[PDB]
Design a protein around this ligand. Structure first.
Ligand SMILES: [Mg+2]
Lengths: 305, 190
C-alpha cells in the first residue's frame, strides 16, 4: 500500500507530472529522468547495482524518442561498506556508460552511519535529446496500433528473486540488464509511427499495458502463444504459480506502432543484438480493457500486480 | 421463420437438424435466450468432437429429453423434480442418475445429470424427428456469454458447430438456461 506516489502527485502537481511519462520533455527537444536503485543482492547473475543504475536511466531517457547523452550519479553509502565491492560497482557503471555512448557529468557521494542504509543505494538522473521527428508518449496509443516486445519477458525479476531468496532452479536464470538506446535509435528511424515506448520494470509487462490503457484511454489485447519467455523463466514461474507478466525486466522495451509499420519495427529489432527474441504480441483495442487471448480464442482480463 | 446454414439440405429446417444430429455433427441452435450447441447424447464420437472443439470445458453437459418418461429411464425423478422439469420456467434440473446409459463425455465420474425438457416450438418439432436425448450446452467457446445474434454466432462458433439453425427474430436480451434442483425439502437453484 505505497500510496506515497499519491502524496507525490498531489504536491508536485503540474503538466509534466500529470502526464506520468518515463521522462519529462523540456524545451521541446531535451528529456529528463531520475531513478533510485535499491536492489538486493547488489551482485546477481547477469549484472549488479552499478550496471543497473546506468542502464535503467539510459533507457528511461530514451523512452521519449531520444538519444541519451548525460547522466548524474548519486551514491549513498554505509559506513564500512567494502571498498572492493565499490570499485566493482563503479567499474560496471563506467562500462555501461561507455557502451551506451553516454557520460556521467555530475554527481554526489554521501557516507552515512553504520546501519542507516543497507550497504549502498544509487540514484541516477539522465538527459537526452529528441530525434528529428520523435513523438513518443504513453498517451499516443490509438485503436489499431500494434504492440511489440523487444525480447523475453521476466528475466530480471526472476533472476534477482532466485538469488535473493536462494531458490535453486534446474536452470540458472540471468538478469537481462542492458542499455537499449541503440535499439531505440534504430526504431526511431520510423519517426511518428513509433507511438509509445516503455521498459517493463517494476510491475512487468502487465503494468506497462495498464499505464498505456489509462493514459491513452484505450484497451490492449495480447496473445499468449506470441509472448516470448525463456524456458527457465517459464517453469520457474509455473512452479510457484507466478505470471511472468508481473516480473520485472531491465533489457526490454514495449513498443506501440502504427499498423503498417509493425513488420518493419520487428525486423529493426530482430537485426539488433538486444532484439533477437522480439515479437508482435498484441493490438490496441477500442475497449478500455487489458485482455489476453489463449490458444483457440479464450479471452480473459490481465490481472494487475 | 427458420434458416439452415452449413451444407445443402432439401427439406424443411427442422428435418435438416435431425439429419445432422443423426450423422454425429454439432448443431448450433438459436433458442429463446441465445444459441445452444447440440449433439446426439448417445453418440460417443459426437460428444467427443464437441469436447475437443471446446477444449477448455471439462464441465458436464446438460441433456435435453423429450418427456418425463424418457427422463425416468436415465434419472431418478421425484414429484417435486417433475414439477421443476414440467414447469413453464423450463430449467435444467440436476438429477441423480440411474446407471450409465448415456455416452461417455456427458457427465463422467459424476452421479448426477442436468436434464431439461423442450421449451420452444422448435424443440417439440425436433423431438418427433429424432429418437435420442441431445446435449444442450451453452453456445459459446469456453464460458463467456452465449451468442445471441446470427452473425455473432456464425463467427464465434465457426470452429465448433458444423451447422446452424437460425431465425430472423432478434434476441434483445441474452439469457442462459436456468439450472436448479430439489434437495432437503426445498428447491435449490444453482
Ligand atoms: Mg521506465
Amino acid at each position: 500500500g505505497a500510496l506515497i506516489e499519491e502524496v507525490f502527485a498531489d504536491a508536485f502537481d503540474n503538466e509534466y507530472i500529470r502526464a506520468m511519462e518515463d521522462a519529462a520533455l523540456l524545451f521541446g527537444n531535451i528529456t529528463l529522468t531520475t531513478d533510485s536503485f535499491t536492489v538486493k543482492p547488489l551482485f546477481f547473475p547477469g549484472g549488479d547495482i552499478g550496471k543497473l543504475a546506468v542502464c535503467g536511466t539510459v533507457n528511461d531517457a530514451s523512452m521519449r524518442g531520444a538519444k541519451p547523452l548525460f547522466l548524474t550519479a548519486a551514491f549513498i553509502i554505509e559506513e564500512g561498506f567494502p571498498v572492493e565491492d565499490l570499485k566493482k560497482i563503479v567499474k560496471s557503471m563506467a562500462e555501461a556508460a561507455k557502451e551506451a555512448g553516454v557520460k556521467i557529468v555530475a554527481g554526489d557521494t554521501k557516507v552515512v552511519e553504520k546501519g542507516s542504509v543497507d550497504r549502498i543505494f544509487i540514484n541516477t538522473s539522465g538527459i537526452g535529446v529528441l530525434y528529428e521527428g520523435a513523438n513518443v508518449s504513453i498517451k499516443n496509443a490509438k485503436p489499431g496500433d500494434i504492440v511489440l516486445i523487444s525480447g523475453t519477458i521476466g528475466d530480471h525479476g526472476m533472476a534477482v528473486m532466485s538469488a535473493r531468496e536462494e531458490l535453486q532452479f534446474d536452470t540458472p536464470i540471468f538478469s537481462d540488464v542492458a542499455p537499449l538506446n541503440g535499439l531505440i535509435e534504430k526504431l526511431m528511424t520510423l519517426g511518428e509511427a513509433i507511438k509509445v515506448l516503455r521498459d517493463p520494470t517494476r510491475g512487468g509487462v502487465a503494468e506497462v499495458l495498464y499505464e498505456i490503457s489509462k493514459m491513452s484511454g484505450v484497451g490492449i489485447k495480447i496473445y499468449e502463444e506470441k509472448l516470448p519467455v525463456k524456458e527457465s523463466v517459464k517453469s520457474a514461474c509455473e512452479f510457484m504459480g507466478i505470471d511472468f507478466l508481473h516480473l520485472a525486466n531491465e533489457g526490454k522495451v514495449v513498443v506501440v506502432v502504427e499498423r503498417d509499420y509493425a513488420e518493419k519495427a520487428l525486423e529493426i529489432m530482430k537485426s539488433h543484438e538486444y532484439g533477437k527474441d522480439a515479437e508482435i504480441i498484441g493490438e490496441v483495442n477500442d475497449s478500455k480493457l487489458v485482455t489476453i487471448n489463449t490458444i483457440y480464442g479464450t479471452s480473459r482480463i490481465v490481472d494487475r500486480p | 421463420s427458420l434458416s439452415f446454414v452449413g451444407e445443402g439440405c432439401f427439406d424443411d429446417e427442422i428435418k435438416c437438424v435431425a439429419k445432422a444430429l443423426k450423422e454425429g455433427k454439432i448443431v448450433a441452435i438459436k433458442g429463446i435466450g441465445g444459441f445452444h450447441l447440440a449433439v446426439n447424447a448417445l453418440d460417443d464420437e459426437a460428444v467427443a468432437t464437441l469436447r475437443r472443439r471446446k477444449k477448455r470445458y471439462g464441465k458436464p453437459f446438460a441433456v435435453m429429453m423429450r418427456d418425463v418418461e424418457e427422463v425416468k429411464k436415465y434419472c431418478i425423478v421425484s414429484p417435486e423434480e417433475e414439477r421443476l422439469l414440467l414447469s413453464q420456467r423450463r430449467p435444467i434440473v440436476l438429477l441423480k442418475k440411474k446407471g450409465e446409459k448415456l455416452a461417455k463425455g456427458i457427465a463422467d465420474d459424476l452421479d448426477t445429470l442436468g436434464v431439461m425438457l423442450p421449451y420452444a416450438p422448435i424443440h417439440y418439432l425436433l423431438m418427433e424427428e429424432i429418437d435420442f436425448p441431445i446435449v444442450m450446452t451453452s453456445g459459446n467457446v469456453s464460458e463467456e456469454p452465449i451468442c445471441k445474434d446470427n452473425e455473432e454466432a456464425l463467427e464465434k462458433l465457426k470452429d465448433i458447430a458444423d451447422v446452424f439453425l437460425l431465425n430472423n427474430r432478434d434476441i434483445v436480451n441474452r439469457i442462459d438456461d436456468s439450472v436448479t434442483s430439489f434437495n432437503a425439502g426445498a428447491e435449490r437453484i444453482i
